[PDB]
């Protein structure tokens with residue numbers, strides 16, 4: 358596009374380090390715009406992301422690097438009857454009434470277990486010592502991966518993150534860094550080595566684990582879903598479902614530390630934690646630009662005539678800084694009005710795990726502030742955020758008087 362010639366000089370590294378400056382230009386200049394290094398149109402404003410995600414003239418598509426990472430049928434990348442079946446597969450344990458029966462007994466002992474390892478130290482790095490472990494241990498136990506250690510689940514989602522976001526394409530539209538998928542292939546091979554025996558056992562001996570229910574629920578007598586049919590959704594879980602609740606927790610904490618009067622309010626009044634988290638997700642969206650839709654008919658959007666078959670990446674993290682919608686969106690503010698946000702997406706492909714995720718983050722922050730009410734951020738350690746497809750703080754050093 359002529360007036361966006363400057364986009365040809367945007368780099369993958371620039372977007373990973375801090376996408377907000379480029380996307381501030383995009384929201385003003387071109388809410389729907391082809392980004393050469395990404396090889397795709399991207400939607401950057403709230404109105405366009407919401408329109409594309411809910412439009413009857415669009416359906417899900419996996420991003421190019423997403424397809425190389427997850428293959429088929431990834432729940433995020435399919436539609437029609439397959440999507441309907443995969444949604445019916447994952448939804449039972451995620452139903453709000455079901456989550457409310459057991460979420461507290463799942464997450465709160467886990468949060469306590471990780472807290473007891475450092476709560477008397479006076480210093481911690483909360484991303485690696487608390488947020489990521491609670492997130493992966495909670496989901497891992499729900500899925501049936503009790504025996505897979507939290508360090509391993511963390512390693513897997515980091516490798517899958519890097520593979521899914523290995524998006525750079527060169528002048529010819531080919532992947533610029535094909536070698537960057539090798540780590541994802543290696544993660545998937547390890548995952549298979551660990552998970553295949555569990556599937557073998559669940560096929561014959563179903564139990565209460567969520568993956569056993571993926572094999573068996575809704576199937577005729579003695580039949581199970583083929584493992585090749587469910588594995589891409591297992592991988593999808595082992596990236597975002599494992600990664601995002603820890604990142605949303607951590608970003609919420611960074612935001613509250615940026616507004617010390619608000620941190621104090623939340624510590625004194627934990628009923629404010631859910632509002633704190635919602636603002637945290639808007640302020641640094643954990644799934645920032647990981648998913649996409651493709652047009653099924655010609656459409657006109659934000660002044661652009663798109664042919665049928667055109668992918669559009671949904672940069673929800675940018676939409677959540679839309680200044681048409683928010684005042685001073687780059688500032689964390691607990692008392693912002695409770696406007697809709699797009700950090701869980703929208704439409705038939707919106708997040709299936711919202712209620713579960715919100716409770717995991719809530720219970721983790723409740724127990725953190727009960728154990729360490731006098732938490733303070735270590736201000737010499739700058740909080741670095743990293744990532745374009747998925748974004749969060751790389752570490753969160755904190756201190757407190759023991």
Ligand code: HEM
Pocket residue numbers: 410417432433434444447451496597598599601602605638642643644648649671673699700701702703704705706707708709710711713714715
């Ligand atoms: C704070 C944590 C989380 C955030 C911010 C988040 C956000 C998202 C987003 C942005 C998408 C894509 C939506 C779209 O393209 O419109 C998504 C999809 C999805 N998420 Fe969540 N997620 C979180 C945690 C979880 C967890 C813990 C689970 C599972 C227990 C989960 C299950 C899913 C599923 C199954 C999908 C695909 C839905 C589909 O394509 O039909 N999420 N999530």
Ligand SMILES: COc1cccc(OC)c1O
Pocket residue numbers: 423433521592593594595596597598644647648
């Ligand atoms: C691109 O990868 C993903 C996108 C959205 C949700 C995911 O996990 C639930 C996920 O793993």
